[PDB]
Design a protein around this ligand. Structure first.
Ligand SMILES: *[C@@H]1O[C@H](CO)[C@@H](O[C@@H]2O[C@H](CO)[C@@H](O)[C@H](O)[C@H]2NC(C)=O)[C@H](O)[C@H]1NC(C)=O
Ligand SMILES: *[C@@H]1O[C@H](CO)[C@@H](O)[C@H](O)[C@H]1NC(C)=O
Lengths: 226, 200, 213
């Protein structure tokens, strides 16, 4: 029946106005509120504001007042949120929800958020393509466990995704686990690969991790030694 | 304002699950609960198995005969008249076990020699093989908390359906050499695991 | 013949208190049989204007006719009539309101200017009751009525007064900080009474046609 369609995911450089569209169908656009909320990746949501298409009245949260601007067009039954001035911390998925849960009592006169939208992924990082910086995770005595050691290499400061890691040119696949990358405050990415191997092969078997970064055409081979 | 929810709740399948949402003057105000499955848009909890009961300073959401599809992230929400702001709760990662629990294994790698020779210092703390997928990571430098230059990933499914998480902490070669030891302290279901690396 | 109000006060009975209405249905009475203790009175706190005058006039009436002055379904198409309920007037465990009044709230994010009236054709003198809501905080007022400079105007050839509600934090009575103030007038036969407002009006759902003699 009722649904909210949202503009697709846009990627922008910091400092640029990014606008998200939210269109309503199956109900008379003038009826209910439309709220906007945002969810930082892996975190909770934060309410941002709301606008009523019938009156055009808007209301913003304290953290979001000033830079966000919310408009509407009754003719096309679409509501807009404009994100003037982008910065890295605004990278998040942004939802639009209509307030269709009609309040029952005057005591609590607040329409609840009944139907939501698919979600728009806004990605802002800038950052030019940069080659990975590999630092082997050398096994220490505490990493040795008797019959099985713990060693790897660290892929640090790279942009963009993706990067693939292999060990001994793909011959060593047992005990291998490559972790997903994290976005540092510098704007660059870093991940780690760990290989679980018998502590007997140390100082005898040679361990090399292969790091491939296609976007910058950087291949790194690196020995991991005790 | 500042509604508070638990980081994680674990319930065995077919049992009962309760989620607590604490704040001031919830009283007359109703609390809207939203359910967000991973990678999905949250949906409003409408309501036999689902039922709420608010009393005074705390609102509670209860799920009866928990199912695998019920498992998600739960979010309470209340409008604060004075602040004029809609307030969202912090969040609850409810975990219907369906899989034997496990305490994480921690691996902490020291800054490598060639990163030290490149004028950088990064500690790699690897958290693996755990269930449910929710931990709190705390770094230490000679038993003193460090809350700068820390980056932690959200847990994700491993090769064996268990979860894995990682956390970094960037230094200069001077900060790494200026302390006797550095510690990575993980917490999971009350239990706490600490791993330490030293410049020797 | 008395009226046997019981635990109900005149103000509670005259307005349609939910736990009141279960026991009253008379047409020709002369006395009161009432207890001033309002166990069942103004379930919403406020002031009943010219109350003392109103008890004298109600006392000893030959006829008592209750009729729909403004039908709730037809009179207010551009306003909401179903959300004016409160726990202060709860009945049988469910929030309720006066059986003879109506709490208009916003519809579709708008509270249009309202203009409605009754031309007294009943040939009998009519009792018209209305209230003006005074909310506790500005945010509740904005949510329910949108306009922040609300006005209520009641005009007739015999009665003319314009109310301007204000936002006030008053000590908690029946778990309610806000107040409605209650006002009344008597409509001469052949006279018209006009209500004009942009919010905060407790409209008359039911009016009473009477003859004192
Ligand atoms: C509700 O009533 C107010 C007050 O009369 C209206 O506001 C006036 O509208 C007229 C339009 O001719 C203007 O000339 C005035 O300047 C407005 N202000 C005042 C103080 O009179 C308002 O337009 C009405 N709204 C609706 C929807 O009818
Ligand atoms: C609002 O009032 C107008 C009269 O001015 C009427 O025609 C209309 O049906 C009412 N309702 C809506 C939703 O416009």
């Amino acid at each position: 029946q009722v649904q909210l369609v949202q503009s697709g995911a846009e990627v922008r450089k910091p400092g640029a106005s990014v606008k998200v569209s939210c269109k309503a169908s199956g109900y008379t656009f003038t009826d209910n509120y439309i709220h906007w909320v945002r969810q930082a990746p892996g975190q909770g949501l934060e309410w941002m504001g709301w606008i009523h298409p019938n009156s055009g009245a808007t209301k913003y949260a304290q953290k979001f007042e000033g830079w966000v601007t919310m408009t509407r067009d009754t003719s096309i039954s679409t509501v807009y949120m404009e994100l003037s001035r982008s910065r890295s911390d605004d990278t998040a998925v942004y939802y639009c929800a209509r307030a269709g849960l009609e309040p029952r009592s005057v005591d609590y006169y607040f329409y609840g958020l009944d139907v939501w939208g698919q979600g728009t992924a806004v990605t802002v990082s800038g950052a030019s393509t940069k080659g990975p910086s590999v630092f082997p995770l050398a096994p220490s005595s505490k990493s040795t466990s008797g019959g099985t050691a713990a060693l790897g290499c660290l892929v640090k400061d790279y942009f963009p995704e993706p990067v693939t890691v292999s060990w001994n040119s793909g011959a060593l696949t047992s005990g291998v686990h490559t972790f997903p990358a994290v976005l540092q405050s510098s704007g660059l990415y870093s991940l780690s690969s760990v290989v679980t191997v018998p502590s007997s092969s140390l100082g005898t078997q040679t361990y090399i991790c292969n790091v491939n970064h296609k976007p910058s055409n950087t291949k790194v081979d690196k020995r991991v030694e005790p | 304002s500042v509604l508070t929810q638990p980081p994680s709740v674990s319930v065995a399948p077919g049992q009962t699950a309760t989620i607590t949402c604490g704040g001031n003057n919830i009283g007359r105000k109703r609390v809207d609960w939203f359910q967000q499955k991973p990678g999905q848009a949250p949906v409003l909890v409408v309501y036999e198995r689902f039922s709420d009961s608010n009393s005074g300073t705390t609102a509670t959401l209860t799920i009866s005969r928990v199912e695998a599809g019920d498992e998600a992230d739960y979010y309470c929400q209340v409008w604060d008249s004075d602040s004029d702001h809609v307030v969202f709760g912090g969040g609850t990662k409810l975990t219907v076990l369906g899989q034997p629990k496990a305490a994480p294994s921690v691996t902490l790698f020291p800054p490598s020699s060639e990163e030290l020779q490149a004028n950088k210092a990064t500690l790699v703390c690897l958290i693996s093989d755990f269930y449910p997928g929710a931990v709190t990571v705390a770094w230490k430098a000679d038993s003193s908390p460090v809350k700068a230059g820390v980056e932690t990933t959200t847990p994700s499914k491993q090769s064996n359906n268990k979860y894995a998480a990682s956390s970094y902490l960037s230094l200069t070669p001077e900060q790494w050499k200026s302390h006797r030891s550095y510690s990575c302290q993980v917490t999971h279901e009350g239990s706490t695991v600490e791993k330490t690396v030293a410049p020797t | 013949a008395p009226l046997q109000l019981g635990n109900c006060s005149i103000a509670g009975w005259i307005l349609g208190n939910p736990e009141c209405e279960s026991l009253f249905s008379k047409e020709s009475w002369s006395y009161i049989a009432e207890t001033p203790n309002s166990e069942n009175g103004t379930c919403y706190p406020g002031y009943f204007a010219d109350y003392e005058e109103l008890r004298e006039q109600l006392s000893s009436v030959s006829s008592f006719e209750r009729f729909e002055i403004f039908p709730k379904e037809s009179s207010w198409p551009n306003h909401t009539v179903t959300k004016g309920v409160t726990a202060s007037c709860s009945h049988n465990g469910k929030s309720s309101f006066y059986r003879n009044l109506l709490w208009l709230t916003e519809k579709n994010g708008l509270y249009p200017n309202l203009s409605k009236s009754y031309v007294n054709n009943k040939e009998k003198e009519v009792l018209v009751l209305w209230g003006v809501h005074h909310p506790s905080n500005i945010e509740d007022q904005r949510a329910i009525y949108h306009t922040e400079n609300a006005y209520v105007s009641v005009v007739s050839s015999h009665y003319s007064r314009r109310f301007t509600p204000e936002i006030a934090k008053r000590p908690k009575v029946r778990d309610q900080e806000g107040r409605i103030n209650y006002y009344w007038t008597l409509l001469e036969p052949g006279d018209t009474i006009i209500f004009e407002a942009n919010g905060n009006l407790i409209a008359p759902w039911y009016a009473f046609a009477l003859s004192r003699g």
